[PDB]
Design a protein around this nucleic acid. Structure first.
Ligand SMILES: OC[C@H]1O[C@@](CO)(O[C@H]2O[C@H](CO)[C@@H](O)[C@H](O)[C@H]2O)[C@@H](O)[C@@H]1O
Ligand SMILES: Cc1cn([C@@H]2CC[C@H](OC(C(=O)O)C(=O)O)C2)c(=O)[nH]c1=O
Ligand SMILES: [Mg+2]
Ligand SMILES: [Mg+2]
Lengths: 416, 554
DNA sequence: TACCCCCCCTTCGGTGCTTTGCACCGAAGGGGGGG
């Protein structure tokens, strides 16, 4: 007998109309079974072609999980739904979360199926299950309850959610809890044993509300306290060839857009003649200070580069080869909030696409913990290649935005 | 006494009204056959007569079925189309015979007069109103509205299609060991039942369908192979396409080539090895449909080779979920690739072709990867799984490519099939500068106004050259300068440019290009033994970069 | 003088860095096929 919270899209915007992409046999079977059980439970209901909206659906297995999990690509719906910040429903982000020694991620999306969804809004959650070899026309459902993956659902559920954790919070006031989409971020400074212990307590605690008023049991362990930054570094050599100094000058001249105090006059001089790339040339006394002075500048942080909560985050990724991937997170060009490098991820030396997928998931997770936002990615990959394979490797319950770029590496800038 | 199919609520686009488009002139013969069809629908209950109160008209016309005497009624509801609510189409793709498993017993039926057996939405009926001239505009004529889905309305296919699926629903749940492929009104029904128990189920199927107002005439009830279905012919252990009719005409236009090229595309799914590159080239240009086009020496050579494929009659087999899938690709030259999908040697499920040329400058490896991608996706549509690939590329070649390319790329489980012509990388730039090779600092500039330019280089041994260029651009001159460097150097060479543009193209190892100059550079690179390209920023007082920049700016 | 789906080949305009030229990509309009 619970009353539904009204929800409206942004004025001057239609609902989502995104085409369903082809699904493998195992994913459709999992989806048909899952949708059958959900329809029996009133969570969704069958609809026709007279609802003009559609949102792509597929299925995933989380890290080290053997049971299929439904995932809706609500990216389109999310960008068309009223921001609840204006409403004042939106969740605040705790600056302390990133400082805790252990942070466990719990899937709690299941809670959301308990809460009815506003009748007038349901039509926008329409999706179509496809069939192998098009044996059947698509089978369309829409949501009656709060769907996993929709940005409206954590917003609307917060009240019940705050009430549920309330006891646990008062008992353990040192523990940080952040809710992002279908996930709960629980951080503590406890020793590992008591941390996992406390997470189990919260989970059993969740069961007590579940009895009363994909699975809940899973948990992934982060350590935000140990998150490194990958800065810009110049090589160290006793002898420099013309080629080496050409690389160094191109690199320094590129870096200067980020650190303005960098100078290349003394270094550029060493290149006056038309000399062989392979020739060794001694650094002038003037040149050594300039190189040393630039190392000093690169050691210090950039000036006036801070997080603006109203601007979007952007992530760029470079493939460095030999399984190494670099990334930068920014809101304004050349004002990087974070830089980093990943190595030896799943797929190293055999699968670029799996590696990039892992990279994207890792970067998004860091962005959620640090800023409570997911960045928009600039991916170093052809669109067709990405769209063909990424869902085979996707293990997260959110999907960041992305676009495709093609930037040949002319300076080996973020990796030596 | 039928169970009527509940109607589907349909609205118009907000604040738009109904169509008011008066009938275009009907030539005498036309005016008559129409009148008799109308009277029929009224007797059947399919169309209501009322017209004082409905202000609306939509033009009507009629055209005959193909090779049939009969005349089929069409509505020009296109105005209603712009004004009607959008629909989400439930028809996502086309079934392919190579996705079917083998069935002991098979039936094919067509529902008769499909759209006219499904009731239009009650409230929407009034906008379907139309007017037919009684006797060449002597007296008013007769007004009518549709009671069922009218042909020509954008919501008619989707609505029929979705209703059909809800109707079949209880029959499927309670017969889970039957297979029904519904594509509009045409049904294929297959079972591993005895032709006795099968004929029963079919008749049970026909009954359930008639209970909801869906007729299945015997005239459309195919019972004996070869089954005519979706433009194919189904035999019990093999399928094939319904005959392809290729024009052999001596005079060719644009429109002939479109038709011609299209038919071959359609044939490529089972007749292996089809090529259309030369014929399609004969099409590129603003050339209008009527203008006549003589074939090329190499173009009618293509056409001849195709016929040789289509002489035999080819067939595919059906799918055995217990066996792996295999996709095999062959290089066909000039950016053409064919493939075969099969599970046992020479029993192809289907074939196809990929020939898309994307990018001004590309190579075979990218194109093969794209072809892998096309085949992978097509397979997920038809069988819901990715095939094992057999590809004409050395494992080493692939390793050198994907690990060195700066974009992420990948190919799923695959093995080398030693079938020339092999895909290979035609040259490799060195990673480090070459000791004892001459260093060439290249640069080029053009005048935006004159479009006159210069390209040249200076060298560490004193060698220099500058070439005047006419009718050119900055980016062209930059490529030109690298070309001169490659032309005038020995077998091993270091080249220093400041062209971000030029280095971008060359570093992706293209082997084919839309630019004559790029092909010329590619041709030079293949002959060399070691090439090291190096970029330096312009205007930073480096090297010969400042010494060659002043040559070709003044 | 119609509707809905899928496919390939070409052209063309919009978009963003390779910049004021050039490269990529999606839409649309031609063809094949289905009902
Ligand atoms: O890969 C992008 C590609 O996917 C599509 C098709 O569904 O859209 C999805 O991906 C976009 C990129 O993040 C999202 O913005 C969009 O909301 C989502 O549906 C295509 O639109 C797009 O080309
Ligand atoms: C060919 C064609 C068919 N249709 C409809 C699609 C489903 C209905 O079925 C038919 C039937 O009336 O029986 C059929 O069996 O072919 C007719 C069109 O609307 N426009 C068309 O050009
Ligand atoms: Mg029929
Ligand atoms: Mg210059």
């Amino acid at each position: 007998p619970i009353e539904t919270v009204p929800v409206k899209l942004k004025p001057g915007m239609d609902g989502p109309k995104v085409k369903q992409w082809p699904l493998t046999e195992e994913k459709i079977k999992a989806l048909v079974e899952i949708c059958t059980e959900m329809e029996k439970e009133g969570k969704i209901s069958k609809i026709g072609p007279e609802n003009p909206y559609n949102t792509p659906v597929f299925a995933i297995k989380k890290k080290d999980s053997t049971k299929w999990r439904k995932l809706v690509d609500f990216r389109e719906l999310n960008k068309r739904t009223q921001d609840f910040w204006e409403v004042q429903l939106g969740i605040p982000h705790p600056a302390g979360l990133k400082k805790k020694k252990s942070v466990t991620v719990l899937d709690v999306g299941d809670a959301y199926f308990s809460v009815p969804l506003d009748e007038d809004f349901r039509k926008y959650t329409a999706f179509t299950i496809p069939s192998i070899n098009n044996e059947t026309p698509g089978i369309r459902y829409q949501y009656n309850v709060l769907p996993q993956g929709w940005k409206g659902s954590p917003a609307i559920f917060q009240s019940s959610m705050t009430k549920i954790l309330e006891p646990f919070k008062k008992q353990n006031p040192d523990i940080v809890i952040y809710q992002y989409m279908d996930d709960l971020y629980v951080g503590s400074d406890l020793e590992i044993g008591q941390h996992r212990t406390k997470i189990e307590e919260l989970r059993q605690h969740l069961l007590r509300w579940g009895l009363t008023t994909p699975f809940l049991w899973m948990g992934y362990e982060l350590h935000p306290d140990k998150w490194t930054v990958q800065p810009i570094v110049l090589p160290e050599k006793d002898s420099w060839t013309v080629n080496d100094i050409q690389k160094l000058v191109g690199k320094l001249n590129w870096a200067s857009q980020i650190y303005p105090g960098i100078k290349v006059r003394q270094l550029s001089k060493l290149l006056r003649g038309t000399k062989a790339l392979t020739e060794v040339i001694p650094l002038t006394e003037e040149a050594e200070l300039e190189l040393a002075e630039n190392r000093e500048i690169l050691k210090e942080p950039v000036h006036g580069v801070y997080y603006d909560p109203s601007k979007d985050l952007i992530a760029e990724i470079q493939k460095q080869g030999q399984g190494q991937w670099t990334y930068q997170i920014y809101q304004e060009p050349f004002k990087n909030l974070k830089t980093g490098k990943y190595a030896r991820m799943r797929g190293a030396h055999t699968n670029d696409v799996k590696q990039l997928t892992e990279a994207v998931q890792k970067i998004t997770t860091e962005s959620i913990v640090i800023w409570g936002k997911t960045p928009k990615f600039k991916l170093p990959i052809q669109k067709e290649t990405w769209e063909t394979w990424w869902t085979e490797y996707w293990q997260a319950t959110w999907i960041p935005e992305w676009e495709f770029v093609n930037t040949p590496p002319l300076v080996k800038l973020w990796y030596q | 006494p039928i169970s009527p199919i509940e109607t589907v609520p349909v609205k118009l686009k907000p604040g738009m009204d109904g169509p008011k488009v008066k009938q275009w002139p009907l030539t005498e013969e036309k005016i008559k056959a129409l009148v008799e069809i109308c009277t029929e629908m009224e007797k059947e209950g399919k169309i209501s007569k009322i017209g004082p109160e409905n202000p609306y008209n939509t033009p009507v016309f009629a055209i005959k079925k193909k090779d049939s005497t009969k005349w089929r009624k069409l509505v020009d509801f296109r105005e209603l189309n712009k004004r009607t609510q959008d629909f989400w189409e439930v028809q996502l793709g086309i079934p392919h015979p190579a996705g079917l498993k083998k069935k002991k017993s098979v039936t094919v039926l067509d529902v008769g007069d499909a759209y006219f057996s499904v009731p239009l939405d009650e409230d929407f009926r009034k906008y379907t109103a139309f007017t037919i001239p009684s006797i060449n505009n002597e007296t008013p004529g007769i007004r009518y509205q549709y009671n069922v889905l009218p042909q020509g309305w954008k919501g008619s296919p989707a609505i029929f299609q979705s209703s059909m699926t809800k109707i079949l629903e209880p029959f499927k749940k309670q017969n889970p060991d039957i297979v029904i492929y519904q594509y509009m009104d045409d049904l294929y029904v297959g079972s591993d039942l005895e032709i006795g128990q099968h004929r029963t189920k079919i008749e049970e199927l026909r009954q359930h369908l008639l209970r909801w107002g869906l007729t299945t005439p015997d005239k459309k009830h195919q019972k004996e192979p070869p089954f005519l279905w979706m433009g194919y012919e189904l035999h019990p252990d093999k399928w094939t396409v319904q005959p392809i009719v290729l024009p052999e005409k001596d005079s060719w236009t644009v429109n002939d080539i479109q038709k011609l090229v299209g038919k071959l595309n359609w044939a490529s799914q089972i007749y292996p090895g089809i090529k259309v590159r030369q014929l399609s080239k004969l099409l590129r240009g603003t050339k209008a449909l009527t203008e006549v086009i003589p074939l090329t020496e190499e173009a009618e050579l293509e056409l001849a080779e195709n016929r040789e494929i289509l002489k035999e009659p080819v067939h595919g087999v059906y799918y055995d979920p217990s066996k792996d899938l295999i996709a095999e690709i062959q290089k066909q030259g000039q950016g053409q690739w064919t493939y075969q999908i099969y599970q046992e040697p020479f029993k192809n499920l289907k074939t196809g072709k990929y020939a898309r040329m994307r990018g001004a400058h590309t190579n075979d490896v990218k194109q093969l990867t794209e072809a892998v991608q096309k085949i992978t996706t097509e397979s997920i549509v038809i069988w819901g799984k990715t095939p094992k690939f057999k590809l004409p590329i050395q494992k080493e070649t692939w390793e050198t490519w994907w690990t060195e390319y700066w974009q992420a790329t990948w190919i799923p489980e695959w093995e080398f099939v030693n079938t020339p012509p092999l895909v290979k990388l035609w040259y490799q730039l060195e990673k480090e500068p070459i000791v004892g090779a001459e260093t060439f600092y290249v640069d080029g500039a053009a005048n935006r106004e004159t479009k006159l330019g210069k390209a040249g280089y200076v060298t560490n041994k004193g060698r220099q050259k500058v070439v005047p260029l006419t009718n050119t651009t900055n980016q062209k001159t930059e490529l030109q300068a690298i070309y001169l460097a490659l032309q005038d150097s020995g077998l091993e060479v270091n080249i220093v440019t400041d062209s971000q543009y030029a280095l971008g193209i060359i570093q992706a190892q293209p082997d084919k290009s839309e630019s004559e100059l790029v092909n010329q550079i590619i041709e030079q690179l293949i002959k060399k033994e070691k090439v090291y390209l190096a970029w330096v920023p312009a205007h930073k007082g480096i090297g010969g970069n400042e010494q060659v920049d002043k040559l070709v700016s003044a």
